[PDB]
Design a binder for this molecule. Structure first.
Ligand SMILES: Nc1ncnc2c1ncn2[C@@H]1O[C@H](COP(=O)(O)OP(=O)(O)NP(=O)(O)O)[C@@H](O)[C@H]1O
Ligand SMILES: [Mg+2]
Lengths: 555, 586
C-alpha cells in the first residue's frame, strides 16, 4: 500500500480532472438512487392522496424532480465516462514520461541483467496496470463510500435508526466483504499464477524439444505430464469461480436483507409518527436502489492487488542507481580528439587521425561500452584528447563520439526521424545527400523520407540497416567514431562497399574499429590483435605481416 | 465483412461440447427472471397492504416469508448460474487445447520450428483462454437479455398495458439508435485506425531503443516525443470514445425515461390527471410498485450484456488465429507399418528425393547418394543450402517424394515408432526437456543400470564438470538449461546420444555455439562415437575433415561434389572456395 505512494503523487498534476471524474461518478450514482426513491415516494403519496387530493397534493414538484433526476443520471453517466477516461489518458502520459526519464540514466547497465524483450513487455504492462488504479480502484471505492454517506445523512433527516441501519449494512459490506474475499482468494490466486507459469514452462519444453522427445520416445510421457498440469490448473480456476459465485450470491442477500429490514422496521414508524404512509416506500426503494453503489466494489479492491504488484516492479526497477555519473562541467565539445588508453589491462594510444582496427577472436563489444561510458572501468583510466573521460558531461560526451551499434535499432518513426535522430538540426536536403553517398537508394524512392520504417512499416535488411547506422554516424559527425563489427554477417559484394565507405567518408576522423574479419585491413593504421582482453602485437598491415606473429597465421 | 460471420460460426460450432451447460444456464436465466417478477410482486403487495390498507407488519408474516424465500432462491440461482457458466467455458477450452496440441504434435518438429516457442504459448495459453468469457458470460447473458425483459412485459401487461408499453416501446428504439450512433462510431474508428496503431507501440519502441537514444544524446528529446505521441493518442482515442459512450448512453437514456414515465403515469393516474392504461378496474398501488420495481430490471439484462460485448471481440480475435491454424492444409509424412529388425548399422541409399516442408515447399532438390553400413559421412555447404533438411528427412520429420531406402527398405514404408528406436542424434541446440540433469541423460533409456549409466557419462565428458554443479549427477536441470551453460548443455545432449545403441547417428552441428573448451570435448566424444555405426554429420568447421569417408557439399539442396577430403580440397571446386571462405574470418 506504501508502494503506490510515488504514483499517487503523480496525480497532483491533474488533481482537478481526476476529482471531477469522481464527483460525476457520485452525482450519477445519487441520481440513480434519487430517481427511484423519489418515484417510489411519489407513487405512495399520489395513491394516498387519491382523487380527492388532486388539488391539495403538489404533484408538480415531484414531477419536476423525477425529470431532473432522470436527466442528470443520463448525462451524468456520459460525462463521467468522458472525464474519467480523459484523465486516465493524462495519467498514462505522465506515467510514461516519469518511467522513461528514470530508465534513461540506467539504460545499458541497469537493464543488463534483465533479459529484454520480456522485461520491457513487463514494463509496458506494469505502466498500463498502474493506469487502471484510478478507474478500476479509486473511482469505484471512493464513489461507493460517499454515496453511502450521503444517503445515510439524507435519510437521517427522517429517521436515525433507519438511516444508520441501511447505512450500517451498506457501510459494513463496503469495509468487510471486499477484504474478506481477497483473503479467501489469496491462496488460489497465487496457486493460479504458479500452475499457469508452470504449464507454460512444460509447454515450451514440450514444443521446443519436440525433435528430441519424438526420437527418444518420450513425447507421450511428457504430454500427459503437461495435461496433468492443465487438469490441476483448471481446478484452481474452478475454485476461483466458486468464490466469485459466492461473492455475487452473498451481495444479493445483503441487498435483500436491507430491503427486508426497511420493509419491516419502517412499518412500525418512520421518525415520530406510526403508520407512515408514503415514507415506507421512500426507505424500501432507497435500499433497493442504493446497492448499485456497491456493485463494482469487490472487483475494485481485488484489482488493487495487481496495481500494488506493478507498483513494486516499476518502483524497484526505476529506483536503481546509475553506474556512471556525469559531471555538469559544461566543457566545450572537442575537435580532432586523440583517444589515449592505459591499463584498461590493455593499453593503446590512438592519435587524432589514426584508423585503428582491433582483431578480437571470434555479443556487444566491451571496449566500446567503456568508451561511451556505459560503465566506468575498474582498473585503468580512459582519456579523450589528453583529458579524462569522466571529465566530460553527457552532452559533450555524446558529441565527441559517434558510435555505430552492432544492433542497429530501426525506430518506428519515418525515415526522416530515423536520420534526424543523429542530427536534429540538419535540413531535408542533407538527409537526401547522405542517403545517396551511403548507397541507400531504394529508400529515397516513392517519397521515402516520409515512409514509415520499423514496426508498422517497411523492414530494412541486414546489409541495408548497416548503411543506416553509418548514415547516422556520418550525420552526427564527431571526431571519434567507434565502429562495432560493421561487416558482420554481411554480403561480400557490400562488405567491400561498407569498408570503402568507412575509408573515404570518415577519412578525417579518429576511427576505432572492433572486428573479427580480416578483409580490408590494409588501409587501417596500427592494426591491433586482441585475445582474452590482451594485446599481442601492433603495427601496420605490412609491418605486422612481415614479422611472424598472430596476424600472420590468420592471413 | 463475412470474416465475422465465419468466425462467429466457428465459435458456435466449438460450443457443442458444452451444450448441456449452455442449456442449463439458459434455463437458469429463465428462472431468474421468474424470481425477479415474484420478488417484485410480493414487495408490491406487502407495500400496498401497509401503505393503503394500513395493515400491521405482524399480520403480513406470510408475504414476508414468501418474499424472503424468493430472495434466497435468487441468490441460489445466481451462485448456481455462475458455476454452470464456468463449466461451459472450461470444457470448450479443454477440448480445443487438446485439438491444438494434437495438430501440433502430429505436425512434428518441422512445423513447430516455424514460429518462436513463445508464439505457440500465446496461441495455446492466451488465445484459448480468451474464449472463456464468450461461453461463460456472454452467451448466457445473450439469452438472459432476451428472456428476462420479455418476462417483465408479460407480467406487467395483465396489471396495466400502458406500463407494459413504456418498457416495450423502447425495445425497438434502443437498437435503432445504437446502430444509428454505431455507424458514426465506425467513421471515427476507421480514419483513426492506422494512426492509433502506430501510436500504441510507440512507448515500447522508444523503450526498446534506449541504447540508441543514449549514444546519440537524444534521451531528453525523446521525452517530448512521448509527450507528443501520448497527447495525440488521447486526443484521437477520445474522439472515438465520444461516440462509443453515446451508444452506452442510449440504454441509460431509455432506462431513465422509462422509470420517469412509469412514475409520472402512475402518479398522475392516481390523482385523476390520466384515465387511460388500465382495464377500467382502477389502477392500484401494487400495480405501480410492480411496474416500478421491474422498470430497472427490464434494462439490467441489456446493461450487463453491454459490459460483456468486449468478450465477444477478444473471442473472435482469438478464434481468428485459432481457425487459420486449424485449417492449414499441411500434409504429414506418411507412416508405414514395416519394422526394421536388423539392429546393426544401416545403409542409406537415395535418389531423386525432393524433401518438402509440411507447407508443401520443396527444401532439398535432386539428391543422389549412397551410404554403406558403418561409413561416416559429412554434409558441408553454405547457410540456407538445405543441409539440415536431409537430417530431418532421415529422422522422419519431413516428407519426401522419391526413393530414400534405408537398409533396402524405403523410409515412407517404415513405422516411425520402431524406426526411431535405432536412431540417435545430436542437434545444434541441446533441448533438455526432462526434470534433472540425470533425467536428461536417462531420457533415451528410462530404465538402465548405473554401470552403463556412468559409462555414458564420462565417455561424453560430462563427469568432468559434475562436481562443479551444486548437486552433481541429480542436479535439477533448469528450464531452458538456464542453470547450465551452452557448452555444458551440449555435452549432456551427447551423453544421451551415446547411452542407447544406435543403428544411425545424425549430428546436426554439435560443436556450433560452444565455448573454447567443450568444443573439443564434444568432438572427442562424437568423433570416437561415429565409428561404432553409420553416421552422417553437418558442419561448418572444415579444418579437421581429413578423416571422414565422404564429403557431401551441397548448394540449393543439391549434392555437388563427393569423395575423400583431400580430393575436393585442392580440386578447385565449390569446397575449395568454401574452405577459403573460413579464412576471411578469424
Ligand atoms: N520447415 C520449414 N518450413 C519452411 N522453410 C523451411 C523449413 N525448414 C527449412 N526451411 C528453409 O529451407 C532452406 C533450407 O535450409 P536448411 O535446411 O536450414 O539448411 P541449412 O544449411 O542447415 N541452414 P543453416 O542451419 O543456416 O546452415 C532455408 O531457406 C530454410 O529457411
Ligand atoms: Mg542447419
Amino acid at each position: 500500500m506504501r508502494a503506490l505512494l510515488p504514483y499517487l503523487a503523480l496525480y497532483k498534476r491533474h488533481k482537478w480532472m481526476l476529482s471531477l471524474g469522481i464527483v460525476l461518478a457520485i452525482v450519477t450514482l445519487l441520481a440513480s438512487i434519487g430517481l427511484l426513491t423519489l418515484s417510489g415516494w411519489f407513487l405512495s403519496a399520489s395513491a394516498v392522496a387519491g382523487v380527492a387530493g388532486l388539488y391539495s397534493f403538489n404533484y408538480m414538484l415531484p414531477a419536476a424532480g423525477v425529470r431532473g433526476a432522470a436527466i442528470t443520471r443520463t448525462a451524468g453517466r456520459y460525462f463521467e465516462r468522458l472525464v474519467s477516461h480523459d484523465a486516465t489518458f493524462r495519467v498514462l502520459q505522465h506515467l510514461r514520461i516519469y518511467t522513461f526519464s528514470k530508465l534513461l540514466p540506467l539504460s545499458p547497465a541497469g537493464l543488463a541483467r534483465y533479459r529484454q524483450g520480456e522485461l520491457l513487455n513487463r514494463v509496458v504492462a506494469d505502466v498500463d496496470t498502474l493506469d487502471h488504479l484510478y478507474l478500476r480502484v479509486i473511482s469505484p471505492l471512493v464513489g461507493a463510500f460517499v454515496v453511502i454517506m450521503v444517503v445515510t445523512i439524507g435519510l437521517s433527516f427522517l429517521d436515525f435508526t433507519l438511516a444508520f441501519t441501511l447505512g450500517g449494512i451498506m457501510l459494513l459490506t463496503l469495509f468487510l466483504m471486499p477484504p474478506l474475499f481477497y483473503r479467501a482468494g489469496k491462496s488460489t490466486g497465487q496457486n493460479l499464477t504458479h500452475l499457469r507459469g508452470q504449464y507454460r514452462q512444460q509447454l515450451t519444453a514440450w514444443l521446443q524439444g519436440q525433435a528430441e522427445l519424438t526420437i527418444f520416445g518420450a513425447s507421450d510421457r511428457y504430454r500427459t505430464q503437461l495435461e496433468n498440469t492443465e487438469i490441476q490448473w483448471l481446478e484452481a480456476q474452478r475454485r476461483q469461480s466458486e468464490l466469485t459465485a459466492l461473492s455475487q450470491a452473498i451481495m444479493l442477500l445483503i441487498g435483500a436483507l436491507a430491503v427486508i429490514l426497511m420493509l419491516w422496521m419502517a412499518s412500525g414508524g418512520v421518525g415520530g409518527n406510526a403508520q407512515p404512509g408514503a415514507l415506507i416506500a421512500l426507505f424500501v426503494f432507497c435500499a433497493l436502489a442504493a446497492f448499485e453503489a456497491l456493485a463494482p466494489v469487490t472487483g475494485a479492491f481485488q484489482h488493487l492487488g495487481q496495481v500494488i504488484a506493478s507498483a513494486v516492479r516499476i518502483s524497484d526497477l526505476t529506483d536503481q542507481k546509475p553506474e556512471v555519473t556525469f559531471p555538469d562541467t559544461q566543457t566545450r565539445v572537442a575537435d580532432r580528439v586523440s583517444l589515449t588508453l592505459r591499463d584498461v589491462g590493455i593499453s593503446l594510444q590512438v592519435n587524432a587521425g589514426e584508423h585503428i582496427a582491433i582483431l578480437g577472436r571470434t555479443g556487444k563489444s566491451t571496449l566500446l561500452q567503456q568508451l561511451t561510458r556505459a560503465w566506468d572501468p575498474q582498473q585503468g583510466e580512459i582519456l579523450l584528447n589528453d583529458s579524462p573521460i569522466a571529465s566530460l558531461n553527457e552532452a559533450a560526451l555524446r558529441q565527441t563520439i559517434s558510435v555505430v551499434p552492432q544492433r542497429v535499432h530501426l525506430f518506428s518513426a519515418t525515415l526522416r526521424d530515423n536520420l534526424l535522430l543523429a542530427s536534429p538540426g540538419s535540413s531535408d536536403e542533407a538527409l537526401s545527400e547522405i542517403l545517396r553517398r551511403v548507397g541507400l537508394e531504394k529508400l529515397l524512392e516513392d517519397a521515402g523520407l516520409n515512409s514509415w520504417l520499423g514496426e508498422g512499416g517497411r523492414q530494412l535488411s541486414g546489409g541495408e540497416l548497416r548503411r543506416l547506422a553509418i548514415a547516422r554516424a556520418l550525420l552526427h559527425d564527431a571526431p571519434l567514431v567507434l565502429l562495432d563489427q560493421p561487416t558482420e554477417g554481411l554480403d561480400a559484394t557490400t562488405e567491400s562497399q561498407i569498408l570503402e565507405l568507412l575509408a573515404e567518408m570518415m577519412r578525417e576522423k579518429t576511427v576505432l574499429m572492433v572486428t573479427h574479419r580480416l578483409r580490408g585491413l590494409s588501409r587501417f593504421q596500427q592494426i591491433i590483435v586482441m585475445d582474452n582482453g590482451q594485446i599481442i602485437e601492433q603495427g601496420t598491415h605490412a609491418e605486422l605481416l612481415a614479422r611472424q606473429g598472430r596476424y600472420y597465421q590468420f592471413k | 465483412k463475412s470474416r465475422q460471420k465465419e468466425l462467429t460460426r466457428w465459435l458456435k460450432q466449438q460450443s457443442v461440447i458444452s451444450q448441456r451447460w449452455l442449456n442449463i444456464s439458459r434455463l437458469l436465466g429463465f428462472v431468474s427472471g421468474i424470481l425477479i417478477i415474484a420478488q417484485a410482486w410480493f414487495m408490491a403487495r406487502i407495500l400496498q397492504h401497509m401503505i393503503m390498507e394500513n395493515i400491521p407488519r405482524e399480520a403480513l408474516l406470510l408475504p414476508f416469508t414468501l418474499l424472503v424465500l424468493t430472495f434466497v432462491l435468487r441468490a441460489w440461482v445466481v451462485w448456481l448460474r455462475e458455476r454452470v457458466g464456468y463449466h461451459a467455458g472450461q470444457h470448450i477450452r479443454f477440448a480445443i487445447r487438446r485439438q491444438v496440441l494434437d495438430r501440433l504434435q502430429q505436425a512434428g518438429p518441422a512445423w513447430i520450428q516455424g514460429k518462436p516457442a513463445g508464439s505457440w504459448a500465446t496461441l495455446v495459453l492466451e488465445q484459448i483462454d480468451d474464449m472463456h468469457d464468450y461461453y461463460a458470460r456472454y452467451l448466457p447473458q445473450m439469452a438472459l437479455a432476451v428472456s428476462v425483459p420479455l418476462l417483465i412485459v408479460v407480467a406487467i401487461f395483465p396489471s396495466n398495458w400502458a406500463a407494459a408499453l413504456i418498457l416495450l416501446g423502447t425495445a425497438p428504439l434502443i437498437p435503432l439508435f445504437m446502430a444509428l450512433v454505431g455507424m458514426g462510431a465506425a467513421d471515427a474508428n476507421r480514419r483513426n485506425f492506422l494512426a492509433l496503431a502506430r501510436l500504441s507501440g510507440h512507448f515500447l519502441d522508444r523503450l526498446r531503443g534506449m541504447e540508441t537514444l543514449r549514444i546519440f544524446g537524444r534521451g531528453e528529446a525523446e521525452i517530448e516525443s512521448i509527450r507528443s505521441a501520448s497527447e495525440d493518442f488521447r486526443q484521437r482515442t477520445m474522439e472515438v470514445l465520444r461516440l462509443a459512450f453515446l451508444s452506452s448512453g442510449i440504454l441509460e437514456f431509455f432506462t431513465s425515461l422509462s422509470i420517469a414515465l412509469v412514475a409520472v403515469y402512475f402518479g398522475f393516474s392516481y390523482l385523476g390527471e390520466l384515465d387511460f392504461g388500465h382495464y377500467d378496474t382502477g389502477v392500484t398501488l401494487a400495480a405501480g410498485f410492480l411496474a416500478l420495481i421491474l422498470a430497472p430490471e427490464f434494462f439490467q439484462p441489456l446493461r450487463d450484456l453491454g459490459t460483456f460485448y468486449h468478450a465477444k471481440a477478444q473471442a473472435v480475435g482469438a478464434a481468428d488465429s485459432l481457425k487459420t491454424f486449424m485449417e492449414t492444409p499441411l500434409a504429414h509424412p506418411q507412416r508405414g507399418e514395416a519394422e526394421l529388425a536388423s539392429t546393426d548399422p544401416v545403409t542409406i541409399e537415395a535418389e531423386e528425393l525432393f524433401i518438402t516442408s509440411p507447407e508443401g515447399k520443396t527444401l532439398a532438390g535432386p539428391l543422389n547418394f549412397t551410404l554403406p553400413a558403418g561409413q561416416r559421412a559429412v554434409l558441408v555447404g553454405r547457410s540456407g543450402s538445405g543441409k539440415s533438411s536431409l537430417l530431418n528427412a532421415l529422422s522422419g520429420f519431413l516428407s519426401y517424394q522419391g526413393s530414400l531406402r534405408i537398409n533396402g527398405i524405403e523410409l515412407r514404408d517404415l513405422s516411425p515408432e520402431s524406426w526411431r528406436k535405432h536412431l540417435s542424434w545430436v542437434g545444434q541446440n541441446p533441448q533438455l526437456p526432462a526434470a534433472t540433469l540425470r533425467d536428461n541423460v536417462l531420457l533415451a533409456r528410462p530404465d538402465a543400470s548405473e554401470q552403463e549409466l556412468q559409462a555414458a557419462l564420462d565417455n561424453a565428458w560430462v563427469s568432468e564438470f559434475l562436481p562443479l554443479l551444486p548437486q552433481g549427477v541429480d542436479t535439477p536441470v533448469g528450464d531452458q538449461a538456464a542453470r547450465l551453460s551452452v557448452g555444458q548443455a551440449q555435452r549432456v545432449a551427447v551423453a544421451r546420444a551415446l547411452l542407447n545403441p544406435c543403428s544411425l547417428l545424425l549430428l546436426d552441428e554439435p560443436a556450433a555455439s560452444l565455448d573454447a573448451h567443450s568444443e573439443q570435448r564434444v568432438m572427442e566424444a562424437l568423433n570416437a562415437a561415429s565409428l561404432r555405426q553409420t553416421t552422417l554429420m553437418v558442419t561448418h568447421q572444415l579444418e579437421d575433415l581429413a578423416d571422414w569417408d565422404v564429403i557431401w557439399v551441397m548448394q540449393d539442396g543439391r549434392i555437388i561434389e563427393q569423395g575423400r577430403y583431400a580430393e575436393l580440397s585442392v580440386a578447385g571446386g565449390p569446397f575449395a572456395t568454401l574452405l577459403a571462405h573460413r579464412q576471411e574470418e578469424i
